[PDB]
Amino acid sequence: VMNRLILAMDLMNRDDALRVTGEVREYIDTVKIGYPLVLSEGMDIIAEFRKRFGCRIIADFAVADIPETNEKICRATFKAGADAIIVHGFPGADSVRACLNVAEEMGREVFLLTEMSHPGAEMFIQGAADEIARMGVDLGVKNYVGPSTRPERLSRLREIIGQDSFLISPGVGAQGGDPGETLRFADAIIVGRSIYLADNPAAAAAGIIESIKDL
Amino acid sequence: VMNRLILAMDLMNRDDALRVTGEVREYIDTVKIGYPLVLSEGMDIIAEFRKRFGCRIIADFAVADIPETNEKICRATFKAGADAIIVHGFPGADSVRACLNVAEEMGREVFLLTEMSHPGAEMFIQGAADEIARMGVDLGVKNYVGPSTRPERLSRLREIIGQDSFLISPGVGAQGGDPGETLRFADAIIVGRSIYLADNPAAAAAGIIESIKDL
Ligand SMILES: Nc1cc(=O)[nH]c(=O)n1[C@@H]1O[C@H](COP(=O)(O)O)[C@@H](O)[C@H]1O
Numbered sequence: 001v002m003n004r005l006i007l008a009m010d011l012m013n014r015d016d017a018l019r020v021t022g023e024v025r026e027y028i029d030t031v032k033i034g035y036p037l038v039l040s041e042g043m044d045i046i047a048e049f050r051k052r053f054g055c056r057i058i059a060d061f062a063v064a065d066i067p068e069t070n071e072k073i074c075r076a077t078f079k080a081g082a083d084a085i086i087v088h089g090f091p092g093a094d095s096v097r098a099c100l101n102v103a104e105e106m107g108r109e110v111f112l113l114t115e116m117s118h119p120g121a122e123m124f125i126q127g128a129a130d131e132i133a134r135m136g137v138d139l140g141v142k143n144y145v146g147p148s149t150r151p152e153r154l155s156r157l158r159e160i161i162g163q164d165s166f167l168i169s170p171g172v173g174a175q176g177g178d179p180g181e182t183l184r185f186a187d188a189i190i191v192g193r194s195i196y197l198a199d200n201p202a203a204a205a206a207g208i209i210e211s212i213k214d215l
Numbered sequence: 216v217m218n219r220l221i222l223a224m225d226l227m228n229r230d231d232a233l234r235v236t237g238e239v240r241e242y243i244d245t246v247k248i249g250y251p252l253v254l255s256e257g258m259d260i261i262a263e264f265r266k267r268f269g270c271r272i273i274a275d276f277a278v279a280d281i282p283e284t285n286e287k288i289c290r291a292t293f294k295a296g297a298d299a300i301i302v303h304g305f306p307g308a309d310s311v312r313a314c315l316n317v318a319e320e321m322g323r324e325v326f327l328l329t330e331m332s333h334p335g336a337e338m339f340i341q342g343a344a345d346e347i348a349r350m351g352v353d354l355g356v357k358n359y360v361g362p363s364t365r366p367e368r369l370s371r372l373r374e375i376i377g378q379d380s381f382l383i384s385p386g387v388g389a390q391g392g393d394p395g396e397t398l399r400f401a402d403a404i405i406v407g408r409s410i411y412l413a414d415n416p417a418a419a420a421a422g423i424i425e426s427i428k429d430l
Pocket residue numbers: 008010034060062086113115116117118147170171172173174175190191192193194280281284
């Protein structure tokens with residue numbers, strides 16, 4: 001990913017989302033779009049972004065249903081032009097395999113979310129996260145998401161998935177994570193509010209990239 | 216809920232979704248709409264259904280993100296006219312409280328999903344489900360979802376949440392659950408494919424209601 005930085009575009013207005021992404025485009029080449037933007041503006045926003053910016057799009061849909069429904073969600077998401085989808089591992093292996101099957105059929109990718117970045121992840125998810133990551137390895141998952149807010153957990157995840165898997169990490173900036181520390185273990189960092197709520201998003205992105213280039 | 220039956224409308228085409236819901240409307244008064252329909256047809260389909268059928272709409276969005284994102288998802292979902300939203304408990308209490316806060320602000324309801332109905336739920340979710348339900352009780356959640364496919368787990372959930380909480384249950388029909396057994400513990404059952412894939416959905420719904428009225 002360009003500069004190892006993925007923009008989390010969670011503004012809920014098409015005009016604002018387009019303006020901020022355009023302003024930071026020279027620093028990124030992957031945008032993560034989630035339900036805040038899609039539920040406000042529609043699935044067509046994915047193809048619009050892909051066309052206007054020529055970026056890769058990761059659909060952060062935190063997919064977390066039964067296998068049949070997960071299949072339908074993945075099929076709608078890739079039909080809309082997303083390059084990859086983020087899927088929860090907590091619902092178990094059949095739910096994840098449903099997503100992997102559709103990604104195989106459509107030439108796309110699944111990212112497995114293993115431990116979440118927020119405080120509540122400590123309640124249930126963290127205790128399952130090593131096993132979720134091991135399940136990923138055993139299903140042949142090659143792309144993973146783990147938390148910037150806990151780099152010792154990010155280290156342990158990297159250890160489970162090995163050096164050839166690709167690992168991206170949210171929770172940088174607003175949630176407390178550090179870019180440079182997170183990039184010791186992740187291949188790329190995801191940044192939302194620290195860029196898109198900034199008075200000058202391009203300067204915010206540039207400042208992050210500057211602290212990165214040093215590593 | 217009319218006849219204790221909620222239709223899970225997971226067809227992905229507006230025309231087919233409208234036709235089946237119209238055909239079964241005399242038997243239900245609550246429709247659960249999830250991402251298969253919304254990601255195909257847009258969020259406007261919720262208001263369309265609410266207007267055309269005068270039903271209550273539960274948005275099955277399996278919400279499973281960090282608190283800030285959950286807030287945004289809930290706000291978009293209620294702005295679109297949904298009466299209630301389904302939220303995962305696995306991400307922990309802060310994520311659930313974010314949804315409860317928005318439902319309080321907008322005069323709407325949250326359903327907490329506690330154990331899922333599919334086989335993979337046995338891997339991680341089932342081991343956490345009693346505690347997720349207890350967390351719900353301690354947050355003041357009054358509406359819950361638990362699995363028709365495991366009525367001994369549905370009994371244990373009912374025991375945790377008490378008799379005054381409202382409990383709805385998917386996995387009836389296609390996934391193997393039985394209407395009458397599930398209604399020993401749940402207030403209402405959710406049915407999707409057994410109705411909407413039937414040659415005659417009205418006859419399928421009627422046949423279910425007939426086996427219900429007996430209880
Ligand atoms: N999918 C996620 C899983 C996760 O564990 N934490 C996380 O923040 N996210 C998403 O990453 C982004 C973090 O953005 P920010 O905290 O940098 O604003 C938001 O889209 C979150 O929904």
